[PDB]
Amino acid sequence: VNSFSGYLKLTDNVYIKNADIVEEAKKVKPTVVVNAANVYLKHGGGVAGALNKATNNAMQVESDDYIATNGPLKVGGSCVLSGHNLAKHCLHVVGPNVNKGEDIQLLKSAYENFNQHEVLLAPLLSAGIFGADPIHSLRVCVDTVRTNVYLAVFDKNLYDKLVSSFL
Numbered sequence: 001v002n003s004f005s006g007y008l009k010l011t012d013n014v015y016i017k018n019a020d021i022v023e024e025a026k027k028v029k030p031t032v033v034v035n036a037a038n039v040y041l042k043h044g045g046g047v048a049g050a051l052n053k054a055t056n057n058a059m060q061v062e063s064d065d066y067i068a069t070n071g072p073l074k075v076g077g078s079c080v081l082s083g084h085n086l087a088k089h090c091l092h093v094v095g096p097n098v099n100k101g102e103d104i105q106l107l108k109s110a111y112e113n114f115n116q117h118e119v120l121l122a123p124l125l126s127a128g129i130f131g132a133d134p135i136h137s138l139r140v141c142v143d144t145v146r147t148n149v150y151l152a153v154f155d156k157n158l159y160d161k162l163v164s165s166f167l
């Protein structure tokens with residue numbers, strides 16, 4: 001048994017809710033919150049900008065030191081950094097950004113990172129401002145992630161569409 005509330009069960013291991021991931025993280029303090037990162041860990045907008053703002057920019061300060069030491073992530077890759085005030089850990093995962101012209105086939109690789117963590121609170125990768133089809137992202141999530149994932153979808157109309165269309 002865990003602390004996540006009001007999620008709709010989609011599969012054995014995937015659950016979904018219409019919620020602000022920042023507000024969910026603040027309430028649950030999960031072991032792992034997933035950030036929808038870019039390869040430079042520049043947390044400017046969307047879930048990344050919203051998570052970073054909720055940490056008072058501490059996420060960005062930590063990320064800048066990570067990049068200075070290790071260089072950029074790969075598209076499809078990830079790193080584990082602090083969750084600051086939101087979670088124990090933040091798993092920064094880079095899904096492909098269609099609006100930068102990145103290969104959508106890398107979405108499955110991005111979701112595979114979730115399998116290294118038993119439970120996660122996460123964004124629907126490559127959806128929203130990342131430019132991919134969110135129905136497709138949810139399908140790739142359910143077909144790739146085997147650990148327990150609690151998906152927080154910010155946009156209400158997007159949530160209703162994802163639930164109604166889920167196979």
Ligand SMILES: COc1cc(CC(=O)O)ccc1O
Pocket residue numbers: 036045046047048123124125126127128129130152153154155158
């Ligand atoms: C995958 O990252 C994002 C996903 C979404 C979709 C949503 O939850 O409404 C919005 C903004 C984002 O930055």
